[PDB]
Design a protein around this nucleic acid. Sequence first.
RNA 1: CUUGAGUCUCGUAGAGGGGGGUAGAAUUCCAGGUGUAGCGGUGAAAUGCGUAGAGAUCUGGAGGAAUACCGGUGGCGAAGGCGGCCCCCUGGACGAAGACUGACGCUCAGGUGCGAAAGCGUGGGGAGCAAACAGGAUUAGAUACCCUGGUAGUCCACGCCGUAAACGAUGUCGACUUGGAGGUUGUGCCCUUGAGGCGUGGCUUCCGGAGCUAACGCGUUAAGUCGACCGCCUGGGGAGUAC
Lengths: 70, 74, 135, 64, 88
Amino acid sequence: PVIKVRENEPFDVALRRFKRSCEKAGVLAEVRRREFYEKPTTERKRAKASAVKRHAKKLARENARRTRLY
Amino acid sequence: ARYFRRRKFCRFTAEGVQEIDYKDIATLKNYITESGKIVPSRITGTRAKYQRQLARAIKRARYLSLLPYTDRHQ
Amino acid sequence: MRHYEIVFMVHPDQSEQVPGMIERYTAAITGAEGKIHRLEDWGRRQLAYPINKLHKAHYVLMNVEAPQEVIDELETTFRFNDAVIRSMVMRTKHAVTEASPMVKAKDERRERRDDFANETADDAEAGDSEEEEEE
Amino acid sequence: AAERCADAVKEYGIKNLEVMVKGPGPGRESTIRALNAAGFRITNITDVTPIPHNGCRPPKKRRV
Amino acid sequence: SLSTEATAKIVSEFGRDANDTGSTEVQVALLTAQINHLQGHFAEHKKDHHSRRGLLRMVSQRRKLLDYLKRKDVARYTRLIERLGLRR
RNA sequence: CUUGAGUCUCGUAGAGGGGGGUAGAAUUCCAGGUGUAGCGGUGAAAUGCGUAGAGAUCUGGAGGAAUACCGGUGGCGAAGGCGGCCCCCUGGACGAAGACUGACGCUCAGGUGCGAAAGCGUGGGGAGCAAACAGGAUUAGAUACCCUGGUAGUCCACGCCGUAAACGAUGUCGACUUGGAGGUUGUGCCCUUGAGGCGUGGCUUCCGGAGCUAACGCGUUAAGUCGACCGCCUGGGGAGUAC
């Protein structure tokens, strides 16, 4: 939840970025699921896959930006 | 010129062939965090063969009750 | 013959009564043309469950050359003793050539790898002498 | 919960705390912020969630 | 699983050459001495089907090298069964 | 005959296997002190836990199951699969060097052994989850999602029919042979070329010329070429059902 800290009562510094025990934490990898030989890299390629108009628009911005012809 | 400045178990063939041993629990402390986790090859300063060998000895000492294995104890 | 290594454990009350055990084990190995290359104490260690209604116990380490059947025999002696409360013995192992090697691991025991129920001073009357200018 | 607990101990004359936290729930810093704002002085915040060496099979919620 | 000292005692006075370990008889004597350690293993380790399969591999090959010796001379094959003790 | 194949010595990596042993930590559970009416559970709570002294916090005690990190397309396995620590025994691999045997070889119907899981007989065991059963909630409907509880089961030792997305998709063995890049791992030699390199030998991943390609792609481990031997299919349902 709170980790350990050199800090003076951190509660007004909006830290969450490391401040877990299981919640987006590294020990969640064997907690509450099967072994999955393929899943954990498959589920990256799948998550990324649908937002392709927004993807391609940044790519096009960068190709049009990069050439110094404007 | 000859020779150049080697890295831990580097520039030679006949070192770290067999395992890095557990009895030096003081040296093993170097290769664990403050939550009793193992540190990988890039952090122990060693390459793949030697890290696999470190991680067996680190395991050994903790389950022998000789090295730290969490921030907590009872 | 083989280079060997021996761990064994006794209660905290027996952590300055373990050199009397180490005398007999030494005498088994020297009796066999074997030699003691190191003798070392890992001190008081904390236990996940009480043995004979106490949560802590005392570890010691010997490092030797001995015939392998002596250390077969000695692993069985610990495992038949009720005062010696647990062991491990391991094949093909040797001592350090270092003097006082164990003091730095005594230091690690008293700091993070016990629950410090008992004084450092009784557990230190085991094993390797803490010659702090050698290590 | 932190404010009602700060009030719960008022008579024992404590003012100085350190803090220990466990469990997956989000009651882990908003709690502390309102704890300190109910007249106490915090100095340290430390986790005491027990973590395993693998351990036993976990409880199930939403059949996960 | 094999002692060095049994293998050594075979080639002590058998084998067609300096550092022969390879003569037909000596292959089958070394496989018998291998079998004799593994037979006493799988006797008590009845669910060790690694060792079961390894035992099978040895006795098949040893039977094919006994057969190779019986293909040379049938009396020299039965002399190898004599000198190694196998069967009632 | 030694070249295929076989054999020991010897260097060596390994989550290979079987038998037994073991340490710390955890999920779970209780009492009691302290404390005082709360706790718990979602989508909603109800079911469920309390006030008859809980939950929470401290300290004492109890059980049964499993090893987080490390960790790699890595290493190992007969395949199924194999990851904390010790002994003992043990199968297979990998490799600098010694040689040796003298085609002793290859396949394989049938045969013989193993074969994730579910189940289950036997004896032990019952933490966790949870078939069954029991109880609960939502909605127009809800036997379900969701929830409380939980026996069996799993797990230990032993036995039983064996099956699977046993999809790691490509029968075993041999020869022939494109190139490149990545990972791993044994080892001789050395400016140990810098980084260890380099030779050398095995594994393994991807990429890829040519070949092969309905198509994806595959591609020297060919979705290639040539041979030996061996399995499967032959429209769909009826159906591995019936008899």
